[PDB]
């Protein structure tokens, strides 16, 4: 049973860069009929995988020309000749020459770009939520880069969540949620801000 070692498992590159991913099969996956059943799949967040390349080198219909694959025997490559923002995704190779079929473990692509300062908003607890005995106060860091930011409100009582990179800006957004009991019922550090902004 064939193992497909895919590499790298993750990388950071910019718009314009060449990206080069390899899948190594633990044995020859060339079928006795002379064909090689290796496809390359693209999984944007958060959707279904789509086919880009099939049987090593075939560009699936409608796929842009900057994608390609080659290789042979046990050594296979997937190339994006010049990366774009909408190419942020996890890529996978898929071999179906002989069962059991197998995917590579995936190459998660992350895109670097210019520093953008987050525009920030704060929201007090809901009208309706105060009747419940709890208060959630929420802070939104919007459309920024890189993802490292510091938000202080308090400590041990807020949580954050960050969006996947935007397929157009390659920016992120972030939430900090303060929860306290009602009641009872936001300052940001970021490389794009020459000075910490309080909301």
């Amino acid at each position: 049973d064939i193992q497909m070692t895919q590499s790298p498992s993750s990388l950071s590159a910019s718009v314009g860069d060449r990206v080069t991913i390899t899948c190594r099969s633990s044995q020859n996956i060339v079928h006795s009929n002379g064909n090689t059943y290796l496809d390359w799949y693209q999984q944007t967040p958060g959707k279904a995988p789509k086919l880009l390349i099939y049987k090593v080198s075939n560009r699936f219909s409608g796929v842009p020309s900057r994608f390609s694959g080659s290789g042979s025997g046990t050594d296979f490559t997937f190339t994006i000749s010049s990366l774009q923002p909408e190419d942020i995704a996890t890529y996978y190779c898929f071999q179906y020459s002989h069962v059991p079929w197998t995917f590579g473990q995936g190459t998660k692509l992350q895109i670097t770009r210019e520093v953008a300062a987050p525009s920030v908003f704060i929201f007090p607890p809901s009208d309706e939520q105060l009747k419940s005995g709890t208060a959630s106060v929420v802070c939104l860091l919007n459309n920024f880069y890189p993802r490292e930011a510091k938000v202080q409100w308090q400590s041990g009582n807020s949580q954050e969540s960050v969006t996947e990179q935007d397929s157009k800006d390659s920016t992120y957004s972030l939430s900090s949620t303060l929860t306290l009991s009602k009641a009872d019922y936001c300052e940001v550090t970021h490389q794009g801000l020459s000075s910490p902004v309080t909301k």
């Binding site: 099939y54 409608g62 079929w101 969540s161 969006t163 939430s175």
Partner: protein, 202 residues
């Protein structure tokens, strides 16, 4: 729309896949899963003409795969569920006699997000985030996921729906926002609890 179930550790889950007459004649049907944040993992498949199937060794003793000719539905049942089987399970297809065609993943949206946990089901409450940026706080549900929409899918640009975070209580919470400079409504639904709400944001 995809399914969503929670199952207790040790139990089994059985998932179905609706396909067509043409799929059962012309493609191999196979089951894939994808844990949260992780990679695609091949479970096994069946040739629905032949009835012969094939498995990943990892699932050899704890998975069965079957296929019903007359209703063209295909099945997978995973037993002895462990926390690490928490995944999205979905079925998928490859031509028996033609090349890969880009239609392999058309049943993905039919799949089921399976959570293996002893926690129970709970619908969320949806609170407005009043203004710029407005939104909805979706708090206190289990399991994942919830689906959020603005204006029934009219609105799209500038929307950010954050990944859920497990709160200290063992329950999930998230927020969904949008920037604008017209009336704005939240569409939140959580299938495991048959919650389907619509909040007006003022």
């Amino acid at each position: 729309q995809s399914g969503a179930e929670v199952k207790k550790p040790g139990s089994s889950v059985k998932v179905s896949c609706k396909a067509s007459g043409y799929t059962f004649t012309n493609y191999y049907i196979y089951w894939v899963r994808q844990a949260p944040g992780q990679g695609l993992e091949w479970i096994g498949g069946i040739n629905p003409t032949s009835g012969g199937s094939n498995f990943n060794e990892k699932f050899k003793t704890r998975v069965t795969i079957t296929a019903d000719e007359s209703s063209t539905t295909a099945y997978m049942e995973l037993s002895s569920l462990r926390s690490e089987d928490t995944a999205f399970y979905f079925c998928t297809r490859q031509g028996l006699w033609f090349d890969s065609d880009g239609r392999g993943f058309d049943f993905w949206g039919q799949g089921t997000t399976v959570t293996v946990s002893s926690a129970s089901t709970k619908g969320p409450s949806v609170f407005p985030l009043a203004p710029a940026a407005l939104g909805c706080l979706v708090k206190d549900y289990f399991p994942e996921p919830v689906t959020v929409s603005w204006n029934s899918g009219a609105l799209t640009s500038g929307v950010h729906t954050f990944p859920a975070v497990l709160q200290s209580s063992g329950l999930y919470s998230l927020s969904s926002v949008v920037t604008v400079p017209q009336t704005y409504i939240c569409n939140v639904n959580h299938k495991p609890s048959n919650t389907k709400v619509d909040k007006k944001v003022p």
